[PDB]
């Protein structure tokens, strides 16, 4: 289920900025709903959606800029405004929003595995990340190169964790052509393969050996490749053989 | 706080505060009470407020159009930019002000609207409009010779209604049935009409009779007018001679009877093209034909 | 360069206001034209199709491919052969075909395109830019504001009617898709259709795919399916200055019997189909074709018979003359349903001075 706000409490303020994706369009102006701000209804009026005809501008398309400025904490009532948001300020809404949706997409995978309301894990995660820390991109980023956020609170789910780590971190294929006319192979192999796997190499045919490199960045995969085909030249020059490696 | 119980309290008034302006201005009176500063929560009241009065509507068309216009110029006010506070004054300000400019632009047609009645003319008038029958007073008062024609309109009675009030003025008249217009237009130099409405097309939204006259009219290309004041357009486009929005019957067929109860039903409002029509009366200027789209175009901006 | 001049058929005394001639089965032309231009060319000079509104969108994409396989010369900047070119793709375009006005208003801004964008950015960087430009403007003016069309005209059909419809346009085809599926009214489509080509036939056949009641008939047997109809809906191609309605082949004579027999006509439109351009009547200019098509006996498109006949040339005057775009008259047609929502036909320019 989706919902849940992004923030702390539910109805926003003064001057904080926000983007919307668009659900109707005109007389008024838009009932819509938010992607930075809960995914609540948040209407702005024709006015303040055109400054610079309009029909072509957007309509219940793709995202906007706007910015708040009247809320009802009583019932449910929120006034935006495109127009007012400054060109600078643009970009920086921008950034606050992929931000916004990277978190979104975070907090998703917590409440697919376990079976468990997705408000609760937002709960739980927003207190020390994005009061505390300042915001749960960042906290994220902090702890993937050294774990020093995630260490504060305590989880009721590890395997999630392992989960969100792997996904946050793929294998590349290997085909090795062993063509050997020498008088010792079979320790040379198991040489090869000693300094090879120790990532996961199997035995298919008699010439041919699949090997499959695991790349924690994608491009980590090349390089332990090229030493691993250094290897196996090193290996086979001394024995009296062959090794033709693709 | 109401805004039908509003409009039905106006029951002996009247004549003064036209219809759309009595509801235009208890739209206004809604408005200032909880707060204009808040648009979330003030315009889907006010929405909510006009579907409920939608709601409640049995054959009245002008109410509708009347809530855009004030829609419209609520919008508009604060397009500026402006401060939250002299704009909204401006806007609670403008509800007593439009009703102050019917009676401006009353002032402004009945000396217009004179012209089009020449030298010894026999009019024949078609329905009852404020505009219409200021334009024969005002003419009267102008000291100039017309005669008049009273057409037998049947809806709450109007031509009974019609012919009483030109008796309070001093204009001869007779009584004409709508059955038998077809036989009077040659001793008739003007036919004039009262609109409920004007499309968007450049038609008209009249009573239970006016197409016929339209059409008459045509035939015997004597002229054909329609004089009302600035505020019944709708964005509504009658696409067919028979099709309108209704609350009542589109035209039933009872079974047989015996104590004779259920008889009467029939259209009680009717369409005219763009065509029937030679010329137009209203504040804005003399104009006629395309001139009525050009005016919502200007209007929604779309 | 090309083929010109020498025509088949006679000079005509009667009608000869337009060209009747052209390259379909190719032989000698420049090798620098792109393949694209030169398969839409030959799609075009014996299209059963199309109709005004496709054409265009076929047009914007083929321009799409020639800007995506654009390269920019180290010596020649951007905007030098780009144009020449352009003009020669239009060139090629009208030996085939008469342009439509949708058409000639993409010409425009595309040739706007090129004077806004300055030669002095990265070339790979430009072209990105402009093909999403382009597909934004294709969204808005055709896709999103068809479906702005299609919403319009779902408020103004009645629930539970009959519809008779004309020719193969891409607007009243998705129309009566949308009313037959989404909606789910109790419709009867009648479709009518001419000689030269079978454009209804085609209309009636996604109709009856769709699973749609429908009757098909001929102009010749109008005064017997009138006495029913309820709304006419006409395939628009443009609407001028005037407001009169420059339409394909049997569109006036339906418009003409729908007015006297009461119910109204009906007009689907695009904000792109609108010209500045003027006429009053069918003879002022003329998209004409070739006898060619008109020679066979119909039943389907080809079929080689040795009938009756055959001979345009030799025959001492025997002028077998076809128009395909006609004009309805002014004051008949009703509704008009475009970009700006809608609007009668007698307030034509109050888009093209909206623009």
Request: proline fraction near 3%.
């Given at each position: 289920?989706?919902?849940?706000?992004?923030?702390?409490?539910?109805?926003?303020?003064?001057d904080?900025?926000?983007?919307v994706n668009?659900?109707?369009?005109?007389?008024?102006?838009?009932?819509?709903?938010?992607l930075?701000?809960?995914?609540?209804?948040?209407?702005?009026?024709?006015?303040?959606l055109?400054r610079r005809s309009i029909?072509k501008?957007i309509?219940?398309?793709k995202?906007?800029?706007?910015?708040?400025?009247?809320?009802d904490?009583?019932?449910?009532?929120?006034?935006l405004?495109?127009r007012?948001?400054?060109?600078?300020?643009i970009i920086?809404?921008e950034?606050?929003?992929q931000?916004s949706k990277?978190?979104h997409?975070?907090?998703?995978?917590?409440?697919?595995?376990?079976?468990?309301?997705l408000?609760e894990?937002?709960?739980?995660?927003?207190?020390?990340?994005?009061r505390?820390?300042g915001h749960?991109?960042e906290?994220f980023?902090?702890?993937?190169?050294?774990?020093?956020?995630?260490?504060?609170?305590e989880?009721?789910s590890?395997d999630?964790?392992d989960?969100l780590?792997?996904?946050?971190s793929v294998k590349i294929?290997?085909?090795?052509?062993?063509?050997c006319?020498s008088?010792?192979?079979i320790?040379?192999?198991?040489?090869?393969l000693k300094?090879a796997?120790d990532?996961?190499?199997?035995?298919?045919?008699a010439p041919?050996?699949?090997?499959?490199?695991?790349?924690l960045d994608?491009?980590?995969?090349?390089?332990?490749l090229?030493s691993?085909?250094?290897?196996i030249t090193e290996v086979?020059?001394?024995?009296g053989?062959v090794?033709?490696?693709? | 706080?109401?805004?039908?119980?509003?409009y039905?309290?106006?029951?002996?008034?009247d004549?003064?505060?036209t219809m759309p302006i009595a509801a235009?201005?208890?739209?206004?009176?809604?408005?200032?009470?909880?707060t204009?500063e808040t648009?979330?929560?003030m315009?889907?009241?006010?929405?909510s407020?006009?579907?409920?009065?939608?709601?409640?509507?049995?054959?009245?068309?002008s109410l509708?159009?009347?809530?855009?216009?004030?829609?419209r110029?609520?919008?508009?006010?604060?397009?500026?930019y402006?401060?939250?506070?002299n704009?909204k004054?401006?806007?609670?300000?403008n509800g007593?002000?439009?009703?102050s400019?019917?009676?401006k632009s009353?002032?402004?047609?009945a000396?217009?609207g004179?012209?089009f009645?020449?030298?010894?003319?026999?009019?024949?008038?078609?329905?009852?409009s404020?505009?219409?029958?200021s334009?024969?007073?005002h003419?009267?008062?102008?000291?100039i010779?017309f005669?008049?024609?009273?057409?037998?309109?049947?809806?709450?009675?109007?031509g009974?209604?019609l012919?009483?009030?030109?008796?309070?003025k001093?204009?001869?008249?007779?009584?004409?049935?709508?059955?038998?217009?077809?036989?009077?237009?040659?001793?008739v130099?003007?036919?004039?009409?009262?609109?409920?409405?004007?499309?968007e097309?450049?038609?008209?939204?009249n009573?239970?009779?006016?197409?016929?006259?339209?059409?008459?009219?045509?035939?015997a290309?004597?002229?054909?007018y329609?004089?009302?004041?600035?505020?019944?357009?709708?964005?509504?486009?009658p696409?067919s001679?028979?099709?309108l929005?209704?609350?009542?019957?589109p035209?039933?067929?009872?079974?047989?009877?015996d104590?004779?109860?259920?008889a009467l039903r029939?259209?009680?409002?009717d369409?005219?093209?763009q065509?029937?029509?030679?010329?137009?009366?209203?504040?804005?200027?003399?104009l006629?034909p395309?001139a009525?789209?050009?005016?919502?175009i200007?209007?929604?901006?779309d | 360069?090309?083929?010109?001049?020498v025509?088949?058929?006679?000079?005509?005394?009667?009608?000869?206001?337009?060209?009747?001639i052209?390259?379909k089965?190719?032989?000698?032309?420049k090798?620098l034209i792109?393949?694209?231009?030169?398969?839409?060319?030959?799609h075009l000079?014996?299209?059963?199709?199309?109709?005004?509104?496709?054409?265009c969108?076929?047009?914007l994409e083929?321009?799409?491919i020639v800007?995506k396989?654009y390269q920019?010369?180290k010596?020649?900047?951007l905007?030098?052969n780009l144009?020449?070119?352009?003009?020669?793709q239009?060139?090629?375009?009208?030996?085939?075909?008469p342009?439509?006005?949708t058409?000639?208003?993409?010409?425009?801004?595309?040739?706007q395109?090129?004077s806004?964008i300055?030669?002095?950015?990265?070339?790979?960087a430009?072209?990105?830019?402009?093909?999403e430009k382009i597909?934004?403007?294709?969204?808005?003016?055709?896709?999103?504001?068809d479906?702005?069309?299609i919403?319009?005209?779902?408020?103004?059909?009645?629930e539970?009617?009959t519809i008779?419809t004309?020719?193969?346009?891409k607007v009243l085809t998705?129309?009566?898709?949308?009313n037959?599926?989404?909606?789910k009214?109790?419709?009867?489509?009648?479709?009518?259709d001419?000689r030269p080509?079978?454009?209804?036939?085609?209309?009636?056949?996604?109709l009856r795919?769709?699973?749609?009641?429908?009757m098909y008939?001929?102009?010749?047997?109008?005064d017997?399916?009138?006495?029913d109809?309820?709304?006419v809906f006409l395939?628009?191609?443009?609407?001028?200055?005037?407001?009169?309605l420059?339409?394909?082949?049997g569109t006036?004579?339906?418009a003409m019997?729908a007015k006297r027999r009461?119910?109204?006509?009906?007009?689907?439109?695009?904000?792109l189909?609108?010209?500045?351009?003027?006429?009053?009547?069918?003879?002022?200019?003329?998209?004409?074709?070739?006898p060619?098509?008109?020679?066979?006996?119909d039943?389907?498109?080809?079929?080689?018979?040795?009938?009756n006949?055959?001979?345009?040339?030799?025959?001492?005057?025997k002028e077998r003359?076809?128009?395909?775009?006609?004009?309805a008259?002014?004051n008949?047609?009703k509704?008009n349903?475009i970009?700006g929502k809608?609007?009668?036909?007698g307030?034509?320019?109050?888009?093209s001075?909206?623009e």
């Open positions: 289920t989706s919902h849940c706000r992004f923030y702390e409490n539910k109805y926003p303020e003064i904080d900025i926000v983007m668009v659900q109707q369009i005109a007389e008024m102006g838009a009932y819509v709903k938010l930075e701000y809960d995914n609540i209804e948040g209407m702005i009026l024709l006015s303040e055109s029909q501008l309509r219940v398309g995202n906007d800029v706007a910015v708040v400025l009247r809320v904490k009583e019932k449910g009532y929120i006034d405004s495109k007012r948001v400054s060109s600078e300020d920086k809404c950034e606050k929003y931000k990277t978190v997409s975070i907090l998703r995978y917590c409440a697919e595995k376990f079976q468990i309301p408000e894990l937002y709960k739980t995660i927003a207190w020390p990340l994005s505390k820390f749960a991109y906290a980023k902090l702890s993937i190169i050294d774990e020093t956020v995630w260490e504060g609170i989880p009721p590890k999630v964790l989960e780590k792997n996904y946050i294929r290997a085909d090795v052509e062993v063509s006319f008088y010792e192979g320790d040379a192999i198991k040489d090869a300094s796997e990532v996961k190499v199997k035995l298919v045919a041919l050996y699949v090997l499959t490199t695991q790349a994608k491009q980590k995969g090349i390089e332990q090229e691993a085909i250094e290897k086979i020059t001394k024995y053989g090794c033709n490696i693709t | 706080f109401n805004i039908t119980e509003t039905l309290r106006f029951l002996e008034e004549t003064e505060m235009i201005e208890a739209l206004v009176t809604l408005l200032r009470i909880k204009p648009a979330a929560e315009i889907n009241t006010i929405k407020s006009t579907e409920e009065l939608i709601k409640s509507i049995p054959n009245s068309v509708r159009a009347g809530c855009d216009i004030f829609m110029f609520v919008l508009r006010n604060l397009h500026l402006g401060d939250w506070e704009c004054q401006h806007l609670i300000e007593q002000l439009f009703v400019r019917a009676k009353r002032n402004k047609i000396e217009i004179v012209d009645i020449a030298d010894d003319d026999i009019i024949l008038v078609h329905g009852y404020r505009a219409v029958f334009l024969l007073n003419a009267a008062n102008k000291f010779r005669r008049c024609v009273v057409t037998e309109s049947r809806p709450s009675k109007q009974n209604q012919y009483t009030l030109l008796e309070q001093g204009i001869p008249v007779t009584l004409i049935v709508d059955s038998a217009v077809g036989a009077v237009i040659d001793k130099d003007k036919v004039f009409v009262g609109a409920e409405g004007v499309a097309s450049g038609g008209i939204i009573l239970v009779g006016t197409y016929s006259v339209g059409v008459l009219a045509h035939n290309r004597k002229p054909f329609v004089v009302t004041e600035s505020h019944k357009f709708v964005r509504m486009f696409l001679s028979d099709d929005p209704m609350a009542g019957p035209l039933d067929f009872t079974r047989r009877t104590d004779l109860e259920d029939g259209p009680t409002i369409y005219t093209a065509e029937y029509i030679t010329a137009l009366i209203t504040d804005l200027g003399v006629t395309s009525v789209s050009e005016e919502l200007k209007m929604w901006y | 360069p090309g083929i010109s001049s025509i088949p058929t006679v000079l005509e005394q009667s009608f000869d206001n337009s060209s009747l052209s390259v089965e190719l032989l000698l032309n090798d792109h393949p694209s231009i030169l398969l839409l060319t030959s000079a014996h299209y059963k199709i199309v109709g005004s509104i496709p054409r969108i076929a047009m083929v321009f799409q800007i396989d920019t010369p010596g020649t900047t905007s030098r144009t020449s070119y352009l003009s020669h239009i060139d090629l375009l009208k030996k085939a075909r342009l439509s006005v058409m000639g208003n993409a010409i425009r801004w595309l040739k395109e090129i806004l300055d030669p002095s950015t990265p070339d790979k430009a072209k990105k830019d402009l093909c597909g934004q403007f294709a969204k808005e003016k055709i896709e999103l504001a479906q702005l069309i919403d319009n005209a779902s408020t103004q059909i009645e539970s009617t008779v004309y020719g193969s346009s998705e129309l009566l898709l949308h037959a599926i989404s909606l009214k109790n419709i009867k489509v009648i479709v009518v001419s080509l079978f454009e209804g036939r085609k209309m009636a056949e996604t795919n769709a699973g749609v009641n429908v008939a001929l102009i010749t047997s109008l017997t399916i009138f006495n109809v309820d709304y395939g628009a191609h443009s609407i001028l200055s005037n407001g009169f420059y339409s394909r082949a006036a004579m339906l019997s009461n119910i109204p006509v009906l007009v689907c439109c695009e904000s189909k609108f010209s500045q351009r003027v006429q009053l009547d069918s003879v002022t200019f003329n998209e004409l074709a070739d060619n098509d008109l020679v066979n006996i039943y389907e498109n080809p079929v080689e018979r040795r009938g006949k055959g001979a345009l040339l030799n025959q001492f005057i003359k076809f128009e395909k775009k006609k004009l008259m002014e008949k047609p509704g349903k970009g809608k609007g009668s036909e307030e034509s320019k109050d888009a001075n909206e």
